Design an enzyme around this catalytic site. Structure first.
Site, mmCIF file in Angstrom:
data_model
loop_
_atom_site.group_PDB
_atom_site.id
_atom_site.type_symbol
_atom_site.label_atom_id
_atom_site.label_comp_id
_atom_site.label_asym_id
_atom_site.label_seq_id
_atom_site.Cartn_x
_atom_site.Cartn_y
_atom_site.Cartn_z
ATOM 1 N N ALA A 64 0.828 -1.196 0.000
ATOM 2 C CA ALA A 64 0.000 0.000 0.000
ATOM 3 C C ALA A 64 0.863 1.247 0.000
ATOM 4 O O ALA A 64 0.664 2.161 -0.809
ATOM 5 C CB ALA A 64 -0.929 -0.010 1.211
ATOM 6 N N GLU A 106 8.480 -8.325 0.018
ATOM 7 C CA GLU A 106 8.222 -9.070 -1.202
ATOM 8 C C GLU A 106 8.683 -8.248 -2.393
ATOM 9 O O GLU A 106 8.221 -7.111 -2.569
ATOM 10 C CB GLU A 106 6.739 -9.411 -1.327
ATOM 11 N N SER A 113 -0.078 0.777 5.309
ATOM 12 C CA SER A 113 -1.434 0.303 5.532
ATOM 13 C C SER A 113 -1.581 -0.151 6.978
ATOM 14 O O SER A 113 -0.693 0.042 7.812
ATOM 15 C CB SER A 113 -1.769 -0.825 4.570
ATOM 16 N N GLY A 151 -2.149 -5.227 6.295
ATOM 17 C CA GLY A 151 -1.056 -6.055 5.830
ATOM 18 C C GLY A 151 -0.066 -6.360 6.937
ATOM 19 O O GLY A 151 0.125 -5.579 7.868
ATOM 20 N N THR A 172 3.327 -6.836 6.668
ATOM 21 C CA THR A 172 4.486 -5.961 6.566
ATOM 22 C C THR A 172 4.158 -4.579 7.096
ATOM 23 O O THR A 172 4.835 -4.074 7.990
ATOM 24 C CB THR A 172 4.965 -5.872 5.123
ATOM 25 N N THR A 190 -10.369 -6.997 2.741
ATOM 26 C CA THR A 190 -9.663 -7.922 1.862
ATOM 27 C C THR A 190 -8.920 -8.986 2.656
ATOM 28 O O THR A 190 -8.763 -10.116 2.187
ATOM 29 C CB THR A 190 -8.695 -7.159 0.963
ATOM 30 N N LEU A 199 4.861 21.232 9.886
ATOM 31 C CA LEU A 199 4.288 20.020 10.467
ATOM 32 C C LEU A 199 4.253 20.082 11.986
ATOM 33 O O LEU A 199 3.349 19.511 12.617
ATOM 34 C CB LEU A 199 5.076 18.801 10.002
ATOM 35 N N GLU A 249 3.472 22.659 13.584
ATOM 36 C CA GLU A 249 2.203 23.319 13.849
ATOM 37 C C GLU A 249 1.046 22.329 13.797
ATOM 38 O O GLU A 249 0.099 22.424 14.579
ATOM 39 C CB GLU A 249 1.973 24.452 12.864
#
Ligand SMILES: Nc1nc2c(ncn2[C@@H]2O[C@H](COP(=O)(O)OP(=O)(O)OP(=O)(O)O)[C@@H](O)[C@H]2O)c(=O)[nH]1
Ligand SMILES: Nc1nc2c(ncn2[C@@H]2O[C@H](COP(=O)(O)OP(=O)(O)O)[C@@H](O)[C@H]2O)c(=O)[nH]1
Ligand SMILES: [Mg+2]
Ligand SMILES: [Zn+2]
Lengths: 429, 435, 332
Positions: free
Chosen positions: B12, B65, B134, B137, B139, B173, B246, B248
């Site tokens: 992902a 993978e 993600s 998953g 991983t 899924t 960021l 902030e």
């Protein structure tokens, strides 16, 4: 990477393997001589997973063909798509199992299992990172059952970490191609539930029914049934032999489909299945495939799913499609069949999507259902075994090879325990 | 001179990154091979530069993978990335957290950290981290938990932002999503500065209803999330009338150490044919952002309260209109913030409009707004996952894989306790104060 | 209770236990001590001491020990999950879902305490000894009574100190904790007011006894040393040198309130009493003309008022507090 080793035991295993390698070679564009004449590089980007690139730019399948009678071996050797197996692989004996399991696991098999394991070890060391083993065998024939169980036990001794796949042709409920098949089935199942990660139960009855009704074929030769099983296996492996928007591997299927160590028996299914004429009169959409895959009349195992519940379900698609469509279809099919799924496993549909069609179609799909209905199968076999053991019929052939009754007692008790576990989880709450 | 690296874990993350870096290379006029034929520097914050006109991204694509990474190496974006970064394992976690956090990922975590350290030390004004991963998953969950713990150990106080893919309520899924989600949440709850909840189901809904595409591929969801990320970083990467960094973000949207799960939202999302027939008022697009049907997480905001909101606008925007629109939003009753936070907004304006990717699905707009909103409705979502977990744990289903892969049941019980504690904290905050 | 919870309670408990209950705890507190409140509750009452003992003996006659009473009537000890589940169901039933923060703690001298942390209501529940059939009662006490009265009171002219003075209000207690205690045991099958009675009793003795003596004295009613330690500390809150006699008489309010409310139940309007806020049952007629009752909340268990009154009768019967006895107790 993630190379897979193919083992073929018993006559059925060897024929299925011949058709299977025909299918794979057709997929990757491999000439019968073993050299690549394809057109798409993606064929070769993972060609190593099943093939080995031998020198002078040839390819040899990672096959290990095993038998105890040279007949079917020679048949494979002479026929086309046999001239590319590496000739040193064809291990065969002379006595023949004689459709006995005692011969296939104690007496005759003990003489060839060593050579088989040696070639296995050579191939394993040849590979870069071994992924797992797939064994193609029967459950009735003596060679298949006995020698395959022995090989599985030995391999699991030498590789307790790899993953194990078996395509065992379960005896049909109505017909009985052999006479002592309950004994072979019980002993083989004992060994399998001991030392296997997943077992793809298949019946010839269901394949007959599919070739008759759905495909509209009145003349189903064994070539066609083996072709169907080969298509199923290719669909199972394409998730790693090919790129995909949501890829899968054998370990993924094992983790998703096997909630408990013992309950790892799957019934497969394939779609679409259209006759020669009735094809252009139907639309090939994801809803159509999905609705096709869920019915007794398209399960390659002779047992109505409605009699039990789907513990888990995996679904591997191919060809270009839209993920949202698949998700919507799975949602609908999980909604309307709510009584057909187990309560305590929410969202029990594993999904994978490849990017290449099965060659000659727009989109296909493979279903792998781990259900509780299969208990009936074992029930049936168990009863049969019991009957043929109550009179101790045919017992002398098995006793004469060192095996004794207590073996049968323990195996039957083990199978009954397995059926009890399936029943318990079917009505869990 | 305000650098920020990107770390993509799992399939992902890698595909989302494909989309994101396509978007960036389009924004700054960067060819796929790193060459380039209101802008400032701009690209320096994400692109490092070598001697020639070739720029390379500050990305670390890690996976177990090699399939998807190989697709990247073979794609049109082959020349771009620094080939050393494309770290590939051998056997993926196979949707197993234990494999992704104890067994397999434990053997390349060191190489990943090494490349991270090289990229960091080559920078000077490092801002923080963007983890694209993600949640279901193996991983994703395992490797991300491990990597976040390692980075928090190494880089003591720096920004750490995640873009998780929250598991949908009805479309799943995977089959072991509750286990991976609970474990990775229990781990990342103490290290991630600010996560970013996004789900696939809501994006399906948005693509069908608003964009009027009935059959979307993952490419479309990836493009949408890439647009969200670009709107987040446009402040760093461009000159704006009211910029925001960021830090902030983490200061504004995170009231308490634990409650740091804001959900994303973007607007406008309209097809090319419907581009006309509406002038796209900034007040209109603000209303679109607050519409419960436009959020990218399947949670009705009306069931909770917006503890904080951060709206980042870009394009031809004028601050007075933003002030008026936000005042109107504050006037309405169906949008009810917590009593104890009377100021529930951070506003940011950028001068650069969003750019449409050729071959895309959206239409060329002049104004755009990304809302990052931290609410209380998301709490209910945890309950659902909790519920699922309970069932799948009441039978000890699938437990044997995790047990045999380097984990114990007491860990599962502890993670369940932690999730219960988080739900308790959300409920406690949701209540009103006395006196 | 936070201010009068000794800062060295643990170190003195270990000392007490390790000396085999012969040591007298030397407690210390967060400075300054609330001198005014200590002085207000420095004297114990004996007005209802025989009612307290009456309730205690009634329990021990039927159940033999407290230990068996607790387990038989209380139900199973609850996990955190079960507590949250019961609480969530209650809040929804009461229509106050999402208003109160819920916290779980081990260091509470009672089952639960309703607070105002961060200027917002907070329900702290003791996870140690939380039980199935008892927990629902706690919620009827803290939320059904204290919280609802509090919210109703905030809407009234007497919502603060000045307002109380101006409208000439008697103290909220003992009516507050009396009502709350009756409500805790409302729908129970054996609604014995054990906690109220034993607190009343322990304070009465604490006034005369050292800690050592008090701890020993309680052995006759409850064996568990941990349970006894709780009751002793509660009775001697604020006492530094517990070797001397003395008490914090506050916890006598529960039984005191129970008796009074039950005695006068026939003339009390219980919905109205709750609607008027933190007010005495005696002030109801005085305050009725000046109360704002449009959007005041009455607890769910008071909707079927006929049933509510039946429960009160059941509570009297169970606790040996019959009409005639209440009549002689308070000839009002
Ligand atoms: N938004 C979006 N999500 C995706 C995409 N591709 C995959 N996913 C998500 O990925 C999840 C599957 O688990 P992954 O995180 O991909 O697992 P992985 O990255 O392959 O790593 P492993 O678990 O070890 O196999 C699904 O739940 C999807 O939601 C994509 O293109 N876009
Ligand atoms: N699907 C399928 N099954 C077969 C085929 N040929 C044989 N079988 C099955 O294999 C079993 C016989 O096992 P076999 O290998 O021939 O005997 P063995 O030499 O003792 O192992 C029978 O039960 C058949 O159902 C085939 O071509 N296709
Ligand atoms: Mg993966
Ligand atoms: Zn109270």
């Amino acid at each position: 990477m993630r190379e897979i080793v193919h083992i073929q035991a018993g006559q059925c295993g060897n024929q299925i393997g011949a058709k299977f390698w025909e299918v794979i070679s057709d997929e990757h564009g491999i000439d019968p001589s073993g050299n690549y004449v394809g057109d798409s590089d993606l064929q070769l980007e993972r060609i190593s997973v099943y093939y080995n690139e031998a020198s002078s730019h040839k390819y040899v399948p990672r096959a290990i063909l095993v038998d105890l009678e040279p007949g079917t071996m020679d048949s494979v050797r002479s026929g086309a798509f046999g001239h590319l197996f590496r000739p040193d692989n064809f291990i065969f004996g002379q006595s023949g199992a004689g459709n006995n399991w005692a011969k296939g696991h104690y007496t005759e098999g003990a003489e060839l299992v060593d050579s088989v394991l040696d070639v296995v070890r050579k191939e394993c060391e040849n590979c870069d990172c071994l992924q797992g083993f797939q064994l193609t065998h029967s459950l009735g024939g003596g060679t298949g059952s006995g020698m395959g169980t022995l090989l599985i036990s030995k391999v699991r001794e030498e590789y307790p970490d790899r993953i194990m796949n078996t395509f065992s042709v379960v005896p049909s409920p109505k017909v009985s191609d052999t006479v002592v098949e309950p004994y072979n089935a019980t002993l083989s199942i004992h060994q399998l539930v001991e030392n296997t990660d997943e077992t793809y139960c298949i019946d010839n009855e269901a394949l007959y029914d599919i070739c008759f009704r759905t495909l509209k074929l009145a003349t189903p030769t064994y070539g066609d049934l083996n072709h169907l099983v080969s298509a199923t296996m290719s669909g199972v492996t394409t998730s790693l032999r090919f790129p995909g928007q949501l890829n899968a591997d054998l370990r993924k299927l094992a983790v998703n489909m096997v909630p408990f160590p013992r309950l790892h028996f799957f019934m497969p299914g394939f779609a679409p299945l259209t006759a020669r004429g009735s094809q252009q009169y139907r639309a090939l959409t994801v809803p159509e495939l999905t609705q096709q895959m869920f019915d007794a009349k398209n399960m390659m195992a002779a047992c109505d799913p409605r009699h039990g519940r789907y513990l888990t379900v995996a679904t591997v698609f191919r060809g270009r499609m839209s993920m949202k469509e698949v998700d919507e279809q799975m949602l609908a099919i999980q909604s309307k069949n709510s009584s057909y799924f187990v309560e305590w496993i929410p969202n029990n549909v594993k999904v994978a999507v490849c990017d290449i069609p099965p060659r000659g179609l727009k989109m296909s799909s493979t279903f792998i259902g781990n259900s509780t209905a299969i208990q009936e199968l074992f029930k049936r076999i168990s009863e049969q075994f019991t009957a043929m053991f109550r009179r101790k019929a045919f017992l002398h052939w098995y006793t004469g090879e060192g095996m004794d009754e207590m073996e049968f007692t323990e195996a039957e008790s083990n199978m009954n325990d397995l059926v009890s576990e399936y029943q318990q989880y079917q009505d869990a709450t | 001179m305000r650098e920020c690296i990107s770390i993509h874990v799992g399939q992902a993350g890698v595909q989302i990154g494909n989309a994101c870096w396509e978007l960036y290379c389009l924004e700054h006029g960067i060819q796929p091979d790193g060459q380039m034929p209101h802008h400032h520097d701009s690209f320096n914050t994400f692109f490092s530069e070598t001697g020639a006109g070739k720029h390379v991204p500050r990305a670390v694509f890690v996976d177990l993978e090699p399939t998807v990474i190989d697709e990247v190496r073979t794609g049109t974006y082959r020349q771009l990335f620094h080939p050393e970064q494309l770290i590939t394992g051998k056997e993926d976690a196979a949707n197993n957290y234990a494999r992704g956090h104890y067994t397999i990922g434990k053997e390349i975590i060191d190489l990943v950290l090494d490349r991270i350290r090289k990229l960091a030390d080559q920078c000077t004004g490092l801002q923080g981290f963007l983890v694209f991963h993600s949640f279901g998953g193996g991983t994703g969950s395992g490797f991300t938990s491990l990597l976040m713990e390692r980075l928090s150990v190494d880089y003591g106080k720096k920004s750490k932002l995640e873009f998780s893919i929250y598991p949908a309520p009805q479309v799943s899924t995977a089959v072991v999503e509750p286990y991976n989600s609970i474990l990775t949440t229990h781990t990342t709850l103490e290290h991630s500065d600010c996560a970013f909840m996004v789900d696939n189901e809501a994006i399906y809904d948005i693509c069908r209803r608003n964009l009027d595409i009935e059959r979307p591929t993952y490419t479309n969801l990836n493009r949408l999330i890439s647009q969200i990320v670009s709107s987040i970083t446009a402040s760093l990467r461009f000159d704006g009338a009211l910029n925001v960094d960021l830090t902030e973000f983490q200061t504004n949207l995170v009231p308490y150490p634990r409650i740091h799960f804001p959900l994303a939202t973007y607007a406008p999302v309209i097809s090319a044919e419907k581009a006309y027939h509406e002038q796209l008022s900034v007040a209109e697009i603000t209303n679109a952002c607050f519409e419960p049907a436009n959020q990218m997480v399947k949670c009705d905001p009306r069931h909770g309260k917006y503890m904080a909101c951060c709206l980042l606008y870009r394009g031809d925007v004028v601050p007075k209109d933003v002030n008026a629109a936000i005042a109107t939003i504050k006037t309405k009753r169906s949008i009810q913030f917590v009593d104890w936070c009377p100021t529930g907004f951070k506003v940011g304006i950028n001068y650069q409009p969003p750019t449409v990717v050729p071959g895309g699905d959206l239409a060329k707009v002049q104004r755009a707004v990304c809302m990052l909103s931290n609410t209380t409705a998301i709490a209910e979502a945890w309950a659902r996952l909790d519920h699922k977990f309970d069932l799948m744990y009441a039978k000890r289903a699938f437990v044997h894989w995790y047990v045999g892969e380097g984990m114990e049941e007491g860990e599962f019980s502890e993670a369940r306790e932690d999730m219960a504690a988080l739900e308790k904290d959300y409920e406690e905050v949701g209540v009103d104060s006395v006196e | 209770l936070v201010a009068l919870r000794p800062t060295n309670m643990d170190r003195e408990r270990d000392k007490f236990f390790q000396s085999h209950y012969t040591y007298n705890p030397q407690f210390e507190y967060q400075e300054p001590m609330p001198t005014a409140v200590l002085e207000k509750y420095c004297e114990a009452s004996g007005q209802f001491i025989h009612q307290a003992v009456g309730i205690i003996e009634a329990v021990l006659e039927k159940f033999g020990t407290y230990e068996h009473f607790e387990a038989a009537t209380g139900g199973q000890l609850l996990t955190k999950c079960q507590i949250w589940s019961i609480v969530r169901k209650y809040m929804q039933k009461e229509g106050c879902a999402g208003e109160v923060v819920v916290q779980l703690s081990e260091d509470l001298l009672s089952q639960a305490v309703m607070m105002v942390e961060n200027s917002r209501p907070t329900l702290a529940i003791n996870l140690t000894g939380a039980r199935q059939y008892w927990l629902e009662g706690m919620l009827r006490h803290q939320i059904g009574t204290h919280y609802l009265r509090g919210v109703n009171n905030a809407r009234q002219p007497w919502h603060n100190a000045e307002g109380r003075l101006r409208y000439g209000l008697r103290p909220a207690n003992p009516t507050e904790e009396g009502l709350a205690s009756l409500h805790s045991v409302l729908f129970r099958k054996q609604p014995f007011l054990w906690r109220a009675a034993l607190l009343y009793y322990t304070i009465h003795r604490a006034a005369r006894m050292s800690f050592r003596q008090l701890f020993q004295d309680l052995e006759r009613y409850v064996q568990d040393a941990d349970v006894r330690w709780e009751y002793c500390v509660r009775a001697k809150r604020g006492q530094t040198d517990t070797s001397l006699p003395g008490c914090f008489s506050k916890d006598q309010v529960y039984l005191d309130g129970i008796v009074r409310i039950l005695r006068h139940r026939q003339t009390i309007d219980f919905p109205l009493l709750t609607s008027l806020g933190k007010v005495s049952y005696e002030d109801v007629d005085h305050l009725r003309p000046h109360g704002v009752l449009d959007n005041t909340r009455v607890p769910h268990f008071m909707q079927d008022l006929a049933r509510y009154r039946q429960q009160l009768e059941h509570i009297m019967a169970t606790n040996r507090l019959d009409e005639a006895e209440l009549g002689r107790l308070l000839p009002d």
